[PDB]
Symmetry: D2
Subunit: 378 residues, 4 copies
């Protein structure tokens, strides 16, 4: 059901990613190197501005085209960490700003994230507030026209390279859910303390440090939405995050399937291609079923959000399905290749290491299941 414009644009995205995004991935993964050159090239192409209206220097593309192009990006670009870093910037930072920001807030910050080279971070999670986000301890005390922010935020994607921080704090912890408020703090604000990026299994080309706020002053002008709107901002941010952060992962799944079919047809054992044995062929049949199901979950959310509908249930189902489908297909691709798929220089192992992250960011598999159960009535 994709038109000529959509086929050609995705084909243009794949070609761009295959030609002008080449990196020494074995080295960048091992050494934990974020590709700033590739981020800059993607922004020049328009990746960041894809769901953003043209009045804020965006590309003003429809959601279905944005999701289709992202899938193309995932297929063409092997750097999964870069893809994750950009999606965090787009869906968890640019989107809530576009929806809840005032005309002056949007006119100042959106063109910068869009075209300017400014990077954004979403800092909401805390050591005792991961799954239980509502139980945030980061307080924001009003002092006339300003706010004094104090707290600790662990896991802040892009933190060490971010120019603007989207922070979820509370005006009063007694209020609970009703006390949650969002603040936009620029990089190098006195009181904003960052750690060195934390070492992890995969997504090593994406910088994830810790953040600490020690009497961090912010004007009431940089507060996103009214006092107490923080919950509505977070729930809206998760809708875009859960449903779209894994759009490119579907593309990666398509690349691994074609690579595995090629190997199952090429590699021979017992006088025949490995794919001639049903135990090998079935792994590719399972990879195919998962890929088509992932596309279905992605395109339903994309359609719903384009038709201005509330799709938290659909985004949760998409994130739960695609994250697990991705890990499983990666595991099977390594199996098809045998011992060869376990070697560093093959690069299939990195794919699995990166895939696991998706089971933790945007919420755990168990959280999505709890969210789905609530929507069923339970």
């Amino acid at each position: 059901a994709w038109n000529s414009q959509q086929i050609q644009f995705r084909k243009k995205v794949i070609q761009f990613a295959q030609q002008s995004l080449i990196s020494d991935l074995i080295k960048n993964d091992k050494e934990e190197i974020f590709n700033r050159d590739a981020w800059q090239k993607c922004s020049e192409f328009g990746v960041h501005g894809w769901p953003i209206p043209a009045r804020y220097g965006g590309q003003e593309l429809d959601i279905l085209t944005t999701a289709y192009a992202l899938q193309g990006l995932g297929y063409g670009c092997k750097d999964n960490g870069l893809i994750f870093a950009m999606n965090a910037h787009i869906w968890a930072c640019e989107m809530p700003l576009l929806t809840f920001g005032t005309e002056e807030q949007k006119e100042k910050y959106l063109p910068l994230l869009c075209r300017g080279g400014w990077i954004a971070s979403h800092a909401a999670t805390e050591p005792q507030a991961g799954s239980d986000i509502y139980s945030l301890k980061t307080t924001a005390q009003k002092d006339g026209d300003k706010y004094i922010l104090n707290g600790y935020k662990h896991y802040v994607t892009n933190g060490t390279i971010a120019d603007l921080f989207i922070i979820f704090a509370t005006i009063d912890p007694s209020l609970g859910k009703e006390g949650l408020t969002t603040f936009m703090i620029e990089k190098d604000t006195p009181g904003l303390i960052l750690s060195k990026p934390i070492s992890k299994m995969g997504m090593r080309t994406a910088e994830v440090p810790e953040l600490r706020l020690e009497n961090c002053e912010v004007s009431a002008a940089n507060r996103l939405g009214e006092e107490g709107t923080g919950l509505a901002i977070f729930n809206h941010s998760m809708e875009w995050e859960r449903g779209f952060i894994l759009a490119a992962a579907v593309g990666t799944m398509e690349r691994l399937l074609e690579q595995s079919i090629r190997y199952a047809r090429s590699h021979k054992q017992f006088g025949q291609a490995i794919g001639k044995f049903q135990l090998v062929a079935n792994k590719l049949v399972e990879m195919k079923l998962r890929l088509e199901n992932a596309k279905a979950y992605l395109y339903k959310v994309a359609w719903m959000k384009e038709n201005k509908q509330m799709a938290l249930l659909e985004a949760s189902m998409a994130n739960l399905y695609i994250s697990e489908a991705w890990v499983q297909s990666c595991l099977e691709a390594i199996e098809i290749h045998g011992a060869y798929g376990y070697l560093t220089n093959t690069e299939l192992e990195r794919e699995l290491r990166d895939a696991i992250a998706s089971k933790f960011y945007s919420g755990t598999s168990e959280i999505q299941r709890v969210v789905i159960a609530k929507f069923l009535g339970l």
Copy 2:
């Protein structure tokens, strides 16, 4: 993405099935009773004529509407055996006749199946030719204007009540695939021998006897397609069968999900509803994920066939997914209800017994996997 006409027609199908299809299903399943009254009422409604053009007395509905209305029928009608019996008549008999039949063959036989109360059977499988259907032994020898048919066909859905038989035979077994030819034989033709309907686990309200042909004479005018076209006719009829026979099963899955949510909310243990325990709620979360995936496989095939595309791969993926998804969801519905779900009077047990059949008719799960692997290039 369904229009007002589609929502209203499916709602009309559910209401019709809930009001005018009421049967003593515990009794009819136990005693193996085929509901002729309900078959007649469905034909009066237009079920049989749904994919048939209005010129042959059909409804001339588009495939996507036909599939949506079928999902509605499955939700509203509890008689899974009747649903299977009708889908076998529509997709494996009416469809190949509409596609490969001459104007005179269609004008004679199609209006009868639509509105005449004529029932059709598809007899292709044999004791030594189930999965290996190309290895058919049923021979057809030409004698001027006629053909003398000899063979044995096991598993003939609707056989004991059919008025017209769609038979897959061979002109010369040496030719193999190129020798396969189809014949339309009317009920009670000298040489057409039927057994008593065979007793099975589920689908007990659908008559499945054995067939024997002892020098069965048939005119060359009643031969569907040219000599050797039988393979093309079978492959076409599988495409429609695999993709659409389980359209109603998706509806049944929707009914059991809502029935299980109601029970998980109603039934209490340890001072709370069972659905408050995550091990119970997760079974409903799995039922929800499977239901949405089943809809996706069904609607892709429906779209493709409507847009006149060859969808054997998509029909095989749909039949493989939906048949297993149904059995699994049926098993979980019994689990949610506990020992209560194991009792005859609850009716959830019959649902599982009926669901298993889907793993054997239209081809086994293993056959679909082999078919998918071939389409992948293995």
Copy 3:
């Protein structure tokens, strides 16, 4: 690790079951007929007396030999309902009586259950006390030397044919878990009301009616253990039940594996035996792995109980594993046979229907998981 005596005795059990237990199983399952003739022959052989001391007319066999012989019984006897009915009588009735009964209680009832043709029932479960068994509503009011019992017990295996009833009641519901008490009530005691046996999916050759107590008088002499000991009696009964009710199911699993290997080697398709296709062969590989794991869980509990140890965790792990392993292997046996495995006259379908019951009696799969989690410290 089995000696000559153990090999020969099991071989003697198989031969006995294969020669003198022959029944019209298709008919008895369809018509719901309990085989009293086979129950009598098993008692004459000594089955019921296997874990019982010779002084109470038992066989005085060690647990490991008892479990090995019961596996042999499961392999040789096709009537799964009879096997379930006998195991309920042995483990849930004879065992708590042997452990908690006084000399006079043992001397009177045990020889009768062993060789007297007396059948016993275990009535503990209630409509609002299934999984939450401690929340029993059946009250027992003391009136000098007697007790007045009032309540309702659903699912009472052997109820319609039992001579002695093992009833779990409460002296005071305010005490809860500390108020539980066990009573032995003889058949046809004024106030003991039984329903017709309830119709179910499988285990149709085992009678499971409902029980109602309306001012049922019982002597303090027929009270098993002291007041408040009911919990200890139930927990002890569950150890023997969970760990040994499925000992014969392991034997049934061995029979279906060899039956399926024979079919996979005999039945041919595409010019070779079906077992030559890896998707068919893998089902038997899975059946083999499950059979060996089931033996391991069964023999661990048998050893522990033989060495007078508390094995509730091990019995729960055995019942959870074996019940699910049995259902899964039954489904695969039907799959290997194709449409043939779905027919009533084949008998593989009945196996699956019987196997499901194991997921509900002796506690549900979810309950076992909860029990295991508590033992782990969670």
Copy 4:
């Protein structure tokens, strides 16, 4: 069923591993450092000599004690790569030498491997002969009292540090299976070329380079067994390898279970410990079931090999079960910990990376399934 001396010896093994095997595992894994100091300490303790008779400087333990002590080593030692490197040396090199070697071959080489600090490698696999091991191309041409070896062996565990090489070659490729012969070649023999150790996902503390033989001369005295015995030697080598290489992995599984229980009880969310949520507690119930099953498969093989029985089927079942059980339990341990389990410094991520290797060494999961199917008669 373990006695006081077996409990005490395993406890002594755990204490030794916990106190005198401490390494900078995050660094060694990242930098690919083999711990020679820990290998030396293990040999001083007697690890290598455990299944070796005291005559050849061994410890002469019974297999059941050896397996129990290896389980203890896996629990106490976190360096999975060292454990794999040692098990490769014991089971694939020392064991075939003990069984097939002459008195002079055993007297010279066994005391060295056992107590001399000599390391051994098993080189059988080739680029065109992995699963299809019979199709070896490495030729051995006789020249009176010597043999000229030519070929290429990929994946040679311990190759870069080995003093003795166990090589599988062919006297005549036309003979196939009947032409297979084993040779013992000492390190630095002209013609023995080794590559740099290959970089892989996990097991990074174990050196796995490639090997090339260019007119490598070896005496007929250093030929293990007679000409054509190579298959019997390999299949005997696979019995010990498959059944005992994963004995320590069972210990690792026990460590991760206790570590995960501690975290599920300690870590709190939504006002309670995470283990109070059934989706978390079930991962630990599954970890428990898998651990007990792994112990059962390990102890069956250990018993059979102690009682001098052919256990290739049992070793294949053990390898297939344990390797998959290990990967799954590692994945779940990371899930229980959330994002915390994905960090390098947590060390759970390395456990999973190491676990995957087990699905490729000693044969792939698919190969074991094929081996099991052959034993069943398919």
